[PDB]
Design a protein around this ligand. Sequence first.
Ligand code: NA
Ligand code: NA
Ligand code: NA
Ligand code: NA
Lengths: 581, 576, 575
Amino acid sequence: TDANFYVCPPPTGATVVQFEQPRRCPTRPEGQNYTEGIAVVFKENIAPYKFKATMYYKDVTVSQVWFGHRYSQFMGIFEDRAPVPFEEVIDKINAKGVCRSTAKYVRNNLETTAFHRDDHETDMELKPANAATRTSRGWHTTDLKYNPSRVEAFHRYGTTVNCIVEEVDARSVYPYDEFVLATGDFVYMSPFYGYREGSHTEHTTYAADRFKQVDGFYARDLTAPTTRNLLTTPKFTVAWDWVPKRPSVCTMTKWQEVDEMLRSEYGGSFRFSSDAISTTFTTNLTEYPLSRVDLGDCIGKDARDAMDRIFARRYNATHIKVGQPQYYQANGGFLIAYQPLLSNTLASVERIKTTSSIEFARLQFTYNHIQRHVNDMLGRVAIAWCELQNHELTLWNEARKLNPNAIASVTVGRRVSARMLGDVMAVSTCVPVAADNVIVQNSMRISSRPGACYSRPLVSFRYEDQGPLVEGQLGENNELRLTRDAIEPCTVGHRRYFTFGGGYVYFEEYAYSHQLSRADITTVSTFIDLNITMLEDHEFVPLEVYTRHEIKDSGLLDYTEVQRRNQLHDLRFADIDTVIH
Amino acid sequence: ANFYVCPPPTGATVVQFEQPRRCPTRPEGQNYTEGIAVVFKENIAPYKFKATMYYKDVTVSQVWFGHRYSQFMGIFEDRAPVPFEEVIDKINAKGVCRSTAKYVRNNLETTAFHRDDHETDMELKPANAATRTSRGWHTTDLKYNPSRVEAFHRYGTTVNCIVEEVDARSVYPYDEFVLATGDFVYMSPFYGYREGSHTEHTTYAADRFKQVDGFYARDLAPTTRNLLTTPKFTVAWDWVPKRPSVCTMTKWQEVDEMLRSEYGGSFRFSSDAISTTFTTNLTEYPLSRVDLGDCIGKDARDAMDRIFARRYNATHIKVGQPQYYQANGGFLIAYQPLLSNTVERIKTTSSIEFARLQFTYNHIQRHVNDMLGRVAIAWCELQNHELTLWNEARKLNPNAIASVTVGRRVSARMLGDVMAVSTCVPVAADNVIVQNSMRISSRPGACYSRPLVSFRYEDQGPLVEGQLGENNELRLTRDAIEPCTVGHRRYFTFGGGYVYFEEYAYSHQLSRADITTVSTFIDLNITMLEDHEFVPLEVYTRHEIKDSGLLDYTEVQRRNQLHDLRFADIDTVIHA
Amino acid sequence: TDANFYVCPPPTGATVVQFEQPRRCPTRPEGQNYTEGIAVVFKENIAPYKFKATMYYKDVTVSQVWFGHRYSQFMGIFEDRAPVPFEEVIDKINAKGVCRSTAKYVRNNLETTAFHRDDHETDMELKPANAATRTSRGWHTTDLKYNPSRVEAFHRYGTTVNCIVEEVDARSVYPYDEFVLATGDFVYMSPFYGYREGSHTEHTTYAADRFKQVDGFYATAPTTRNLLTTPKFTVAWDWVPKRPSVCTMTKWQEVDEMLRSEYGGSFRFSSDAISTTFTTNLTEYPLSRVDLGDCIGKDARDAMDRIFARRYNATHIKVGQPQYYQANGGFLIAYQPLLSNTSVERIKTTSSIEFARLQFTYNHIQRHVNDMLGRVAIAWCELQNHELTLWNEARKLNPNAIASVTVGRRVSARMLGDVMAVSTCVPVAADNVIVQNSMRISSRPGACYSRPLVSFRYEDQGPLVEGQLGENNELRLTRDAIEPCTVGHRRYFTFGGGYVYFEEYAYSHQLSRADITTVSTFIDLNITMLEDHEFVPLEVYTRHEIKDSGLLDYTEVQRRNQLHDLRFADIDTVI
Ligand code: NA
Ligand code: NA
Ligand code: NA
Ligand code: NA
């Protein structure tokens, strides 16, 4: 507060001031132009190529047992796998569901032959292997090992030959120059190797005579032809149905189908936002040439497929497709297939690498969303504020006429004296006067002229604590008027409260009564409340559902662990340096 | 900087001020319930238990002794299982094992004697030390090779009884398991005889399994010891019931303060502590529906009580018995309401991010809506409040107030409690002249309070007399008069500046820029939140994680299987 | 609307009121102080130590072949790998690039010897292994397998010895007490084991004689060549000191502009470029307390300097020495402050950086909204204080209206100096109020009332009282508002819910407020709420896709391969 008093000499043209005129208020931004569309999002494909294959091989075993007195002991059990020749796969196994009891094949640069039970060759029926949970189908000919008849004090050999046929899952990873079987065996030939148109261009690490391709092939299940591939390796023969590389594999995978994908141009790039998955992708304005995608023949297909299925299910009756689907590369390695729409209301080759984290895009979407909202609303507050200030000037132009000192003091920033000199305002500073130098007189009446009373209290004061006593009249807000003119006709029931210092001086019947604190008068406010509080600090702690360790441990068997342990066997349970001689 | 003439308004057009609008009200406010919660996630950890392996390393070498040397012609190596009886009576009961092996290998009952000597029981001594390895025990430590007999082939046998303690792991549905050695055991770790245990899975003949009640583990309390003898070994592990041993769910987070609220037919569980907000249907999730999840009810209470005591026992009270809800993302929430005293498997996502974004978004949303709502309300109140001032201001200067409210220069005058307005006519600045004297030539001591003017509506029109009003208004009636006074100084708005007069005599025009300006405006400087781009960011990429493994099985196999193609001939056949 | 009339008795000092004086407005917070700086963020290293090694071994094979009359059959094929002796590697392989056609080594506690083709030992020239995609380099001496010469009705043995030398990649994980080769072969010796200064302290599970270290070795700069001979092979690799060689941390992010600030007794490192804010204590982290983390200080400086040069050398100056802090989540931060010219342990890092991006995002928005709304609150307080001055003049002009608005109910008011005396007005039913037809004063020609006359009763049965219409439906008890009768008299007086129109000082008719054009004194503001939004779970790759990304699954291959006998053979049957 300022319970300090003031004297305000009449202002002279010395200083003149004018009110600032209306400011040009801001205008609301044009507004973003969004394009309704359907989108299909693709990601780098990390899944291997999977296809069915059949294995044809024979387990060949030759035991050596020495029959001692009362017992017999294995001296050695030689085991090996032999590939079933093409001819035999075609004419025996596939044609008749049978297999020879002999195994003739090349091993260690030598053609070796093995007869089951060691006797004359005979065709054998393939029978279902023994059931087993979570396993493919298998078939074999024999089920018992063949050991030599006993002959004491002698070493004898026995040959076993179990013809085995197994259907197995096959897998291949880019660039598909080789593949693996579910048994752990690698095949160093492309799953797409063949003779038909350019196929022979694919990779193969085997001599020509090891591979065979049979057209219009029919398989027998122990109804359409297939081009059947047949590769015979040193340990087995493997077959699979040949299909062309390009309409089969893809370096991308469909990831998200988005009904409502808004697109907008902004600072040289497109923003693709999906309210449904709370994501915003960013791309250049120029489409990405789909043909540049190394083996991505599934994208166009998949997008069209999904795209039409969505159009029908949701826009066929309210919008129209605007042009051909477009393709864009988003930051993070996401390929977006986009189909613009519009409501009727109007009427070198390379591989894309994708990030495993979509968080940046969700943060982008979230941030953009809040940002847009706060800039929009606070922007409106600003415009409304400016407008209100401009509007207010009109009221101040009228107030300044009724009370120039008060309006000027508020506007100038300090207690001043003022008066209108036309359309401008002349002002002069007022001089402070210590409260202890001001005396309020007991009477407001004028004996001089009966019936006439002063309208406000009379006073006596001095500018300096030692200075002379000057008489005047009390004005508003502690102003000391040098003239005692404020008068009126004495009235009955005279009651008044005048601002005096930090409280009021009360008069009744034109006589001083007493002073008081503002606390004795009830207060009413002209102010409109507004309780704004700050958004408080918040801390985000690291948080994971599963740690890399839990994940590493989610696997039943750990190859590294198993190898580490198993290879310590000798250092643990055996001597390695002792040379017995 | 345009002049206007405003004719007296006629009842022609009458306007009124809009009255106070109904101001918005603050929304009710969300009701939150305090509570304790435990969050479960899909269990991806393998069932783990200890087991012992009993088997013998059977080796039989063949050596051909040359004159100046000796050379191996072959080295048969096999693994023979140790018979039940021998583990029971010899290993478990004595800590010894036979120096011979007899088992079924390739549909034949083979038999081997260590050193090829008579059967002897042998001392099982601890295996040689090795870092990060379980405990092991064996009998022999050397390989027996036939004594030299130049020019002949000879076969020598070896038998090293080995017992190993090893970790066992099994994954749902637990119908089989594996050992630290990589050996699979196709029998449920919970297979047995005791109540329904025989129901479990097994792929062996009844006579390969054996259960020993009240067994007493030897060490080179009772347990219902299980023993399986496989073609290459025998393994034993303590039998325990299935249900109280495994769980398809895992405790993930313990939450002291988990607020719950209901909106739009869903429950929102948010944790300030971990900045997460889960969402669920209002209906609880039948904990009984959880395939093998008896650990849930357990862990939950355990934790909820520990927390209750540690933090709310002295200030709040539990309400009802714990509830269970299925949240989006596959998280199971055990919830325990509080109050101030005052059959299938659940699949869980590996990313909690959606729920934290949810929490973050919700928290900010709540705040801006709350505050901007208060601003909207206060703005409406202020506008209504101001009307009272406009009502007084209009009686004082109708033209000005009406012009601001109407939006264009108009004329106005009150007609009771309503305002009559009429449009004003613009006048080119060049068609306006200010006369030099404000004094009245026919009445002594009487002066015009405001400057007189001579103008013409049209550039060719007659010259009209009148006096300058405020804000460039041209008054047709020169009735603004006052007693002439001494020291007369005045500045009148004229065009885009002021016309200065002294002692009722024109002096000169000035620019507003020549006069000091003071503002009646309260400033406010709002700036926009600027654009921000978030780039892709990962601590470890999936490639780094793949490389984190010491050995890669695919890589190893890929390379090893190329051996013959790289260092040998796979096609050439020799005949002679 | 109100729809109710009021009689307002003259106020008596009974109740007096004053306006609240200006409130002290809030002040703008000081404002956060940010230190510009360069940073380098490190994470726990999950990558194994990698180094090159060379393998020396020999494929030894002894086949047993029985020569039938028309055919031939392998009776058994013994295959083994033999380590190449130190001496041979040195003097034969490394020296002349050849190898012995013989394999002498220890197997199963016995020293066996093998002669290729079962012939006299001869030095053989090593040759490049057959070409193969994505494979290291290898060399061998023989291409074919040797088999016994044909001899009908006889068992025969043939020996093949193929000397093989392969350059392979080696890998080792902390504590580095052992390592593996690309072949899957484990080597239980520290890649750092040796003789030179404390090396012998490193781990090793082999007898001293198996190991050999050759200083000043060749193969164009000498090296300390290690050579370990295991039961199945001999491996060599250039020795290097452990300390500088391996690291338990990995440089992760190089940040040009990393702002640092402190609050609540903690440091905040925020990067606008990667949208991340790290949190740490005010106390540096002893870099030396980092187990084997010798790469940190080096990499930090290399990076730090490169960046300073490229971006701040011409406008900023380094301040102090590089400082190091540990951030929540297990991130080690190397920080270099700038200014314009104007026991021991291993850090464990989280896999998810999201908490830190959320932190940054939230702080950025929080900072912005608190700033602007805070400015709104200040401007609002100032405006409320500012307008009191207008209210001070208004109250003088229309005390009843200004007081009614400030008091919150219809009251009567008058100034008693600088305070306001007020009294409550009494309501009157609209049906108890009658507007006279004339505003003319018969008993005083030329004199007319400026506002309509009325009659009314406080109660539906009470006497009828005379008076005149005031503003906003006030019923004044004194018919004193008079004026000079004039021409073309036109007036609209608020009456009930609308107006009463008077012409030529004569009642004409009443009308709805709808008959008059409405203009507004209100400034509009259209604020709308930010709407609810649901974030659904979303992953690029599920953990199952990741699991499946591996070409061969060991668990799957083992599970299946061990079911061979159970599927294609009888395990329980003795004959
Ligand atoms: Na003005
Ligand atoms: Na306020
Ligand atoms: Na009004
Ligand atoms: Na006041």
